[PDB]
């Protein structure tokens, strides 16, 4: 047997059980099924000076933001394996204890409050898919620097779904090409952000960003994401990153085995 | 550098590109989002060999002890394969070669039902409680594909998973229910819709075929019974699953193909 030692060096690959930040729900009714709330507010409390995207994580460089964060989900470096390949032989079966993190930082807006340096960038990827800036989905690897516990919160939330032009519940006119991310309220005109778990320092996240930016893969910035809509995808899309289906899923359960595929800075 | 180097001794993870086999669209229109089709046909045939509610039967002898709702195909080169020791890799070992069961998968296409399709290699089922009734399963096959079958694209009704939409609104909201499993129908223009089998596996090739709901599972002989439909789901406790199948099989769009995991499980003594 191979011991999980060393730093992944170069790319590298994360498999392992990873939890959802917060879960789509409404006050007193525990949310099981809503995987992929993004919360999505316009409203800026943020000083002019220190800027905050339009979702919960902002991916900041030098008090500029170069990335935002729709989606999170965390885990700690005991209960997942990294490797990294020689195309397709094992080049290492390393842990992430001891990884190294770049300058970039990741900010949390939290229900009233938002935390500056929560995290730390230490790796990232990226894929685009033209619909006709083209829609990207970036996903960032950070190390928590701070333990909060967040406040759960009622805040308009898109989610990822299908463009239905007859909805009925049981049947419903399908658009194939499409893309759609809309609002879905429960109560009032938002839904609820109930963080069940939440990490702490030291552990590991994987927040990511879905929609119309930039991304560049050596420096780890790009642009934030505005605002979601439909999307008209002409062509088919084999994708390459491994997390398309989970930021793609409207409904799903709060954690499960995913795999990610990392790159590290490369000026 | 550790080279794969043997065949998989145990339970295995496999890690790579994985296809689907038909893409939900419409004559005319190319089929790019719609990732997750099952296609349900209540209309059973010739009779002389059973054949389930789905496109894919998984047989021991004549007796449907599974179905296969969705599909997703490789080649034995685009993947990884690693069975563990905890946390220490065991080996780095690759599936050529690879034992298959009795246990058989027979595809109904269009007009024609191919049966010995598939040999079923490995399992792994993961149940989550909705409430003589069976619990929610999610039970996927590893198979070892026997032919190169052509398929025929074709037009029926289509299972497709999302959540529980109460009043819907587009171009855009929509009463959202937590709690809820909702898996309904997905048509366009008249009461069906085209299943467009695009990249077909081929013989010596791998598929993984999953069903989801009320059905149960024995992880020790691979054998279960089939789901007979799909309707709404209430999931009262949360799910930390350990398969690495909900999301890709719970989504109502999605490229046609990315990267996964998956653990298999290989016949218990």
Request: charged residues 15%; hydrophobic residues 35%; glycine residues 8%.
């Amino acid at each position: 047997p191979i011991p999980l030692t060393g730093v992944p060096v170069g790319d590298f690959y994360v498999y392992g059980r990873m939890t959802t930040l917060h879960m789509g729900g409404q006050s007193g009714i525990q949310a099981t099924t809503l995987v992929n709330g993004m919360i999505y507010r316009t409203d800026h409390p943020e000083p002019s000076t220190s800027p905050v995207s339009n979702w919960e994580f902002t991916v900041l460089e030098n008090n500029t933001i170069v990335g935002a964060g729709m989606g999170c989900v965390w885990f700690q470096k005991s209960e997942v394996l990294v490797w990294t390949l020689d195309g397709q032989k094992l080049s290492g079966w390393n842990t992430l204890d001891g990884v190294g993190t770049t300058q970039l930082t990741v900010a949390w807006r939290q229900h009233n409050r938002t935390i500056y340096g929560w995290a730390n960038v230490v790796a990232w990827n990226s894929e685009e898919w033209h619909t006709n800036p083209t829609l990207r989905l970036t996903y960032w690897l950070v190390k928590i620097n701070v333990s909060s516990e967040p406040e759960d919160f009622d805040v308009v939330q898109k989610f990822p779904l299908a463009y239905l032009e007859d909805y009925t519940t049981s049947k419903s006119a399908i658009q194939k090409l499409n893309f759609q991310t809309f609002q879905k309220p429960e109560g009032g005109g938002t839904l609820r952000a109930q963080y069940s778990t939440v990490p702490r320092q030291g552990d590991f996240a994987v927040i990511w960003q879905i929609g119309r930016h930039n991304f560049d893969m050596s420096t780890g910035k790009g642009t934030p994401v505005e605002s979601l809509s439909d999307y008209v995808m002409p062509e088919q899309k084999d994708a390459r990153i491994g997390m398309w289906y989970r930021a793609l899923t409207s409904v799903g359960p709060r954690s499960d085995m995913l795999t990610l595929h990392f790159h590290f800075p490369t000026v």
